[PDB]
């Protein structure tokens, strides 16, 4: 409350460390469905169904331009990429499996880097 604060967690390295995580997600062999925005002209149903499209290149541009106020808003967009994938793709599909694998990969890096 006013003039009453928990001790200050060092967040000075968060930007660099989110960038490194994102590099590792970019270079994963199963990243290919997530590298670029879904083409809304060429994929019937995507625009209407997926209210907030998100992809790794869009996260990279947001990160690089100071559009993440803190490390939690960064994690929310990464998770959005996988929630969207689950919304639109069957589990038993190459893309569906890619999304589960990448979400797992992400959540471990996240816990190991920050928890």
What is the CATH classification number for the domain harbouring 102? Answer: 1.20.920.10
Domain of 25, in residue numbers: 1-115
Q: Which long-range contacts (CB under 8 A, 24 or more apart) does 80-85 make?
A: 80/52, 80/54, 81/34, 81/54, 81/55, 81/56, 82/106, 84/50, 84/52, 84/53, 84/54, 85/33, 85/34
Lookup: tokens for 34: 């997530």
DSSP assignment letter at 8: -
Domain count, the chain: 1
Q: What was the structure determination method?
A: X-ray
* Contacts for 15 with CB less than 8 Å, ≥ 6 apart: 63
């Amino acid at each position: 409350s006013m003039s009453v604060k928990k001790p200050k967690r060092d967040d000075s390295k968060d930007l660099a460390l989110c960038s490194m995580i994102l590099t590792e997600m970019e270079t994963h062999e199963d990243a290919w469905p997530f590298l670029l925005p879904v083409n809304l002209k060429l994929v019937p149903g995507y625009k209407k169904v997926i209210k907030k499209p998100m992809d790794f290149s869009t996260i990279r541009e947001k990160l690089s331009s100071g559009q993440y106020p803190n490390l939690e808003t960064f994690a929310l967009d990464v998770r959005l990429v996988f929630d969207n994938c689950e919304t639109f793709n069957e589990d038993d599909s190459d893309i569906g499996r890619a999304g589960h694998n990448m979400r797992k990969y992400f959540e471990k890096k996240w816990t190991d880097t920050f928890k």
